[PDB]
Amino acid sequence: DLSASVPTRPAEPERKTLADYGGYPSALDAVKQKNDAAVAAYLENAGDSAMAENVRNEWLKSLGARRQWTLFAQEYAKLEPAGRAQEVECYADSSRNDYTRAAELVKNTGKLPSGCTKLLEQAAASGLLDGNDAWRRVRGLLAGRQTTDARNLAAALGSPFDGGTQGSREYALLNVIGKEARKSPNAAALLSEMESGLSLEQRSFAWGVLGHYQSQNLNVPAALDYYGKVADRRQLTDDQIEWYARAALRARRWDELASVISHMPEKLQKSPTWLYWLARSRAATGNTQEAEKLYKQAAATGRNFYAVLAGEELGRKIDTRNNVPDAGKNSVRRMAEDGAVKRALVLFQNSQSAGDAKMRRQAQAEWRFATRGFDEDKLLTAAQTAFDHGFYDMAVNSAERTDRKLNYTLRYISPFKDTVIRHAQNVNVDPAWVYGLIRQESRFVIGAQSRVGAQGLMQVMPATAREIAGKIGMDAAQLYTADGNIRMGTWYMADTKRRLQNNEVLATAGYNAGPGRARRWQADTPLEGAVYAETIPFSETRDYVKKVMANAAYYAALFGAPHIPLKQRMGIVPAR
C-alpha cells in the first residue's frame, strides 16, 4: 500500500499568500538596489515559503558580495540547509575560513558563481588546493574565455600571468587553446612546434582542446589523431574527455572507447551514457559477462534513454504497469491542506484566473519547495493532488522523483488527447512521439514561454510559427492557443521529417536545432540512431533527442500500439 501520511505544516489564508506575492518582485528589486531595509521588511512577516527562501538567497548573495557579514550570518541562519543556494554556501564557508568544499569545486573547469569562485581563490592562497586540479581549472577557464577568473586563480596560486613562471606559460598557450586559435588550420602544427617546452600537463590539455574542437565539428579522423596525443587523459576537462569517447564511438573504435571511459572521473563512468556505451564496447569485444554487469548497472539508473536501451540488451522490454496502488482520495485531499502545498495551489489557481505567467512560475517554485523533503509515498500523493488541480507539470515533477515506487500514469500524463491524437493522425506522425516531444518541451504547460520566446505545449518559435502559418493557411498568433499550437507543432514535426529523409531521429534533432543542423550532423555513411544522438554537437539538442525518444517509448507502452523497441525507434540514420 501507499502510506496515507501527509504533512500538516501551518496554512495561511489565500489573502496572505497573494499579499506576499504582490511584494515578491519588489523585494527582488530591492536586493538589486541594495535596499537592505526594504528586503528585511518584506521578510519580517513572510510565510515560510519559496518566496521568502528565494528573496533570502538572493539577498545573501548580495550581502556576501558586499562583505556585510553580520547581516549575512543572521539571515543564513534562517535558511533550511536543503534550501541554501550553492553560492550562498560558498560565501558562508568562506566567512568561516572553511575550505572543505574546495576539493570538489576545483574539479569544475567552467564559470562558477562569484562566491564560489572567490572561495577557490582563497583556498589557493592558503595552500589548500590540489595543485594538479587547480592548474587544470586555470586551463579550463582560459579555454572557456573566462580569462579574468583564470588570471585571479593563477595569482592566488602564487604564479601570476606576468610572473615569468608557470602562470605566464599557461597564459601564453592561448595561441593554441584560445576560442578562435583552436579553429585555425595551423593550430595542430603550432602546438607540435612548441610542444618540447611544455609540461606533460600542458601538452595533454592542449591536445584535448584541439581534439575537442575537431570532435564537436564531426571531423572524427582529425579528432582521434589529436586526442591520441593526450598522454595524461585525466588532464582533460569533462567535456573534452566525453568528446574523445564520442569520436571513438562514432568511428566504432570499441577498444579505444573502453580505454577512454576508464580514464573518466568516477561520476562520469557511472552515468547512464558511459555505463551503456562501455557495456556495448565489452559486448563488441566478446566480454559477455562484463557487458551484462554494466547493462544491469545502466538499467538500474531509472527511467531514461540509456537505461531502457540497456534493459533491451538484457532481454527486458519497457513495462509501464504501476508497481504501487493509486493514492487514497482522503490523502490526496488532505495533502492540499498542508500549508506549503496549499500556498503553491493558491498561486497556481490565481495565476490561471488572473493570467499571470510570472505568478505561475512562482507557483512552481512553491511546489518544489513544498515537496522537497517528501518520501516516495508523499511524492505520489502530491503528484495526484497536482494533477487534479490541473497543475500538470508539477504532477510529473513529483512522480518522476521516485526510485522504487513507480506510477507511470503520473510520470507520463497524457492530457489533451482529444486534440493531440487527431492532429498527429492528420499528418501521419506517431502520437507517442508527439506526446514524448510535448513532455520534454513544455511538461504540458499550455502557456509555456521559453527564454528565447518559444511558445506553448510544443515550444514553437515565433519565427517558425510565422513560416508555418504562411504554408498551411493559419494566423501566426494561433501559436498562442493550445489547438493552434498543437496543429503547428505536429505539422512542423511532419514537415521537418519529410525534409530529413523521412527519419524520426533526424526530425527530432531538426525540430530543436533546425533541419540544416540536423543534416550537417549526418555522416557520409549510415549511423546507428543512438550514435547519431550521442554525437550531436549541441549539448541542448543532444539531451533533447534522447529524452524525447525515451519519453516516446514510455508513451507507446501506455498507448497499447504494437511494441517498438527503443533500439528500433532509433533505427539507422541515413548517410548524407
Side-chain angles (χ1 to χ4, degrees), residues 17 165 186 192 213 341 417 429 465:
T17 301
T165 55
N186 242 326
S192 294
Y213 172 71
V341 177
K417 273 202 222 185
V429 300

Side-chain angles (χ1 to χ4, degrees), residues 387 409 412-418 435 444 555 558-559:
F387 186 89
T409 51
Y412 301 94
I413 58 170
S414 52
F416 318 132
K417 273 202 222 185
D418 62 353
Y435 266 98
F444 304 93
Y555 281 110
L558 287 167
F559 291 171

Side-chain angles (χ1 to χ4, degrees), residues 38-57:
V39 181
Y42 178 79
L43 290 172
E44 176 184 2
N45 297 119
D48 188 7
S49 59
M51 280 174 286
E53 178 177 278
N54 287 357
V55 168
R56 183 166 284 117
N57 268 299

Side-chain angles (χ1 to χ4, degrees), residues 203-248:
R203 284 193 307 258
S204 287
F205 186 86
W207 287 112
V209 171
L210 299 192
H212 181 195
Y213 172 71
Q214 296 300 324
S215 193
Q216 227 171 348
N217 210 36
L218 304 176
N219 189 346
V220 176
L224 291 170
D225 186 51
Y226 297 171
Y227 273 132
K229 298 175 186 291
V230 178
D232 183 9
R233 294 160 170 179
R234 282 142 167 113
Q235 298 303 319
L236 301 178
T237 68
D238 290 356
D239 283 340
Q240 284 160 3
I241 199 160
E242 292 191 287
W243 274 102
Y244 190 177
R246 284 176 187 124

Side-chain angles (χ1 to χ4, degrees), residues 12 16-31 35-59 75 78 343 347 362 366:
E12 72 203 14
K16 168 69 172 153
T17 301
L18 294 176
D20 292 347
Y21 182 74
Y24 173 76
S26 293
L28 293 175
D29 285 339
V31 176
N35 190 338
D36 294 326
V39 181
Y42 178 79
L43 290 172
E44 176 184 2
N45 297 119
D48 188 7
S49 59
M51 280 174 286
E53 178 177 278
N54 287 357
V55 168
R56 183 166 284 117
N57 268 299
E58 293 307 302
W59 195 20
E75 294 297 320
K78 299 173 188 179
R343 182 184 297 113
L347 290 187
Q362 186 56 29
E366 296 299 337

